From Swiss-Prot, chains A, B, C:
Lineage start: Bacteria, Pseudomonadati, Pseudomonadota, Gammaproteobacteria, Enterobacterales
Gene deletion effect: Leads to decreased susceptibility to a number of hydrophilic antibiotics including ampicillin, cefoxitin and tetracycline. Deletion of ompF confers resistance to colicin E5.
Any one GO molecular function term: lipopolysaccharide binding
Keyword flag Membrane: yes
Main subcellular location of this protein, as a coarse class: membrane
Domain statement: Each subunit of the trimer has a water-filled pore with a narrow, elliptically shaped (7 X 11 Angstroms) selectivity filter which has a solvent accessible area of 30-40 Angstroms(2).
Oligomer and partners: Homotrimer. Forms mixed heterotrimers with OmpC and with PhoE; other mixed heterotrimers are also probable.
Protein name: Outer membrane porin F
InterPro entries: Gram-neg_bact_OMP (IPR050298), Gram_neg_porin_domain (IPR033900), Porin_dom_sf (IPR023614), Porin_gammaproteobac (IPR001897), Porin_Gram-ve (IPR001702), Porin_Gram-ve_CS (IPR013793)
Length: 340, 340, 340
């Protein structure tokens, strides 16, 4: 919500409180999304200052506060800064920002990351270029320097992150994206490649000096309709876990597809239908095994732009015998959202 | 403080910085409240949107930031999200919210949780229905569907929380409260019952498949006067610790009383007097032992609604030989509060 | 940014998002500042209420959110409440605040803590009186009770902090500062002394029952010019580490000098030049060894008061053989800052 706008600077302080509950069965160890309270809140700011006619400075920070932890030792579980970056935008020359931001491959993957609560299964956090990462320098360009309406492109430099965990680490890498939009239709292409760290190479699942991620996106978004599809493959980039052996690392290769269809009624209801499949190929010890496989049905009800409610239902197709231990049961999430 | 109010939505961004210091004696191990710096700050938002004439959506989030930790490894000690919930309110039909909120038994216990800094000793956090918990669905009704002025009621569903700690866990449970207010007087009744988790049952202090908490409240609140009393009992619900053996769990039963008397002078001073006693009955190995036993004297000085100061003095009656190790010394807290 | 100002109370909600990257060489273990992403954000509030003509209440809270952590187990690394205090100010009688605030010796040390990113090397956090600490009661006076324009003074009471770490602990102590300003020139003197805790005494580096810190400050600050110098010594107060033996504690004595020269061009550029040297004397096992020794060059470019950019270059003079293991390589930081 815009709380300050004077002398060229504007600050938007935003957030939400989401009451959220997942319904599955068992001890919780075999479903898609889990079971019980999943409440969470968020707080951030988005600032922008008009340096002059052509030049804008901007900054953004966003934090995730789980609401399903006790005030005891588990108090900070799942809490983190989602975004933290600052940059400059100059006329039609471009923008440049640095800090913790969305990887370039998310430029494609965002087409299908539109479900009520689930979806966007391959846009992992701290995973090279597909989700939020730390230490990325991103150059972005709109309308090809103002010459070609609807034609955008970006390049992104991923600096190495030698963390304690293989899962959360990354070496130096370059990525990019190109897209074109015209009358509701849009097409994107995005690719990234980075070195893996020693620690990543030491894990038992995954062989290669470089991680690679790419995705394609197609969509139709107008007339209250939203149809989207993404196609992508990864090499040594998708984090995987063998639940049986309890080993860990990255899948040698993944083939991933996401499909989404939604309709926005003027009365506020927005039914959603989706299909998601992610398959790991050549997993040492396993070979081909599905990571993600489901059908999705759900709806959001928008009271207005501050209040909404939803039900998100995952018809899980992963089988009970799945070679990696990936859950096979269904999950139904139900949530009430206030946002500003 | 209301920082945004446009197009039906309103956001109140609030908080405070409390400079706070507790004065007791020793190595700190035998007083009521402890010793040294107890500074802390808080930040939250309270949002509300007018969906239409009869329908309101709302959301609230509040965080506690201790101010007595170093910037070292103890940085997050005592930090947590106090509240995180969202809901809807419809005409005189009721309200419904879900997330981390106050348990229904706090509807009674809030009558006496009005001291300058201490008090409200049996409104434990993450303890079924007496304080803040995660995963509660609360229905609330004002004035009996608009038919009986001053007659309110609530029902609350506690979903299971199988955490790592017995202290912070809970099984499924139902609770409720009924109250009546007329001309400064008010009477409340609140009860809750939930299953205990396996981990709770495994502890050495406490036997039972269900936790039970109830409290009654009576008050007079008008003419600058505030008198309140609460009477309550718990079964397998009050967290207790044997300091000598170093065992832990919940008291088989508790009998608890709280009494409060305060006066609000027009010049800003508000003297406070209180009595609090909590007794555990049938503690395995001990039998009857007091958990809480003291007299309270204090005053708050209100410069206005943003600035205030106080002194809170606990005359501790727990004896030096207390069977559980509960401190016997006095505590004096002194604080200066800025809030917005 | 001032987001609320009504009925005597005013709230300033402030913050920034800083994209920041340090460039050094190696595995990172031998430079001045380190290597890689150093992004971080900040959020705080500064409130003030006009109680009456002569009396003001105030409160402040500030948090540091690192932006170079993953959303994994290292999520809270470096996160903390920087400041949390409240107080009262009465006419020309003085101000008094309590909570986590800057130690009095920082009244002197702030003269040279003005570099783009580095500098202020002896204003350690949680280190008696030179940086931010918890549990300090500070009385401050401006213009000698309104009698002597430009003549200020302060006294500060440090309450004991018996933490888990020797580094972050402190005993009871008193400190003070006096300063005088006239036409761009300013001179400060500040001293503090506190008891050390048992844990501090138990460490292998440092002998003494009391910690002592003092600094002198001189500056010229007008005509777009800023020249400053600080001279100070510590006794058993500067935290030190022997990287070779892996021991820890405080230097018996330190001698510290800081020099800064900057120029603020009207077009927005502010070149900076600085010199910093800190020497430890009589370190058990070592004798005299430099802790800090470098030359600094840098510039900040101010687009306006919300956006800025900088380069900060440390020409490190510590030698490769430094007896304590203190890094000898150079560091270049580069950052883009949005603030409000
Ligand atoms: C190619 C990245 C674009 C970054 C914009 C920087 C322009 C700096 O300001 C120029 C003033 O006119
Ligand atoms: C019994 C719980 C009350 C919850 C209110 C929900 C009403 C939904 O909006 C109805 C539109 O009129
Ligand atoms: C010496 C510390 C100054 C603190 C100011 C407290 C004054 C209290 O208000 C007095 C009302 O006039």
């Amino acid at each position: 919500a815009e709380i300050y706008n004077k002398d060229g600077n504007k600050v938007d302080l935003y957030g939400k409180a989401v009451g959220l509950h997942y319904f599955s069965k068992g001890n919780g160890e075999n479903s898609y999304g889990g079971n019980g309270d999943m409440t969470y809140a968020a707080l951030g700011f988005k600032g922008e200052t008009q340096i002059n006619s052509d030049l804008t400075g901007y900054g953004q920070w966003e934090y995730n506060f789980q609401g399903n932890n006790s005030e005891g030792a588990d108090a900070q579980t799942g809490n983190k800064t989602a975004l933290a970056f600052a940059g400059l935008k100059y006329a039609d020359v471009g923008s440049f920002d640095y800090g913790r931001n969305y990887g370039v491959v998310y430029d494609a993957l965002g087409y299908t990351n539109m479900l009520p609560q689930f979806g966007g299964d391959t846009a992992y956090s701290d995973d090279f270029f597909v989700g939020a990462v730390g230490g990325v320098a991103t150059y972005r360009n709109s309308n090809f320097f103002g010459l070609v309406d609807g034609l955008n492109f970006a390049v992104q430099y991923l600096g190495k992150n030698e963390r304690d965990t293989a899962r959360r680490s990354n070496g130096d890498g370059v990525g990019g994206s190109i897209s074109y939009e015209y009358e509701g239709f849009g097409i994107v292409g995005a690719y990234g490649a980075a070195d893996r760290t020693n620690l990543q190479e030491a894990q038992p699942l995954g062989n290669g000096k470089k991680a690679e991620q790419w995705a394609t996106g197609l969509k139709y978004d107008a007339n209250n309709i939203y149809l989207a599809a993404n196609y992508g493959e990864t090499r040594n980039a998708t984090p995987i876990t063998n639940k049986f052996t309890n080993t860990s690392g990255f899948a040698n290769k993944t083939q991933d597809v996401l499909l989404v269809a939604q309709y926005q009624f003027d009365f506020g209801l927005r039914p959603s239908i989706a299909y998601t499949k992610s398959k790991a190929k050549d997993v040492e010890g396993i070979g081909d095994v599905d990571l993600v496989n489901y059908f999705e049905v759900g709806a959001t009800y928008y009271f207005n732009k501050n209040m909404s409610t939803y039900v998100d239902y995952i018809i899980n197709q992963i089988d009970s015998d799945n070679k990696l231990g990936v859950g096979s049961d269904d999950t139904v999430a139900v949530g009430i959202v206030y946002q500003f």
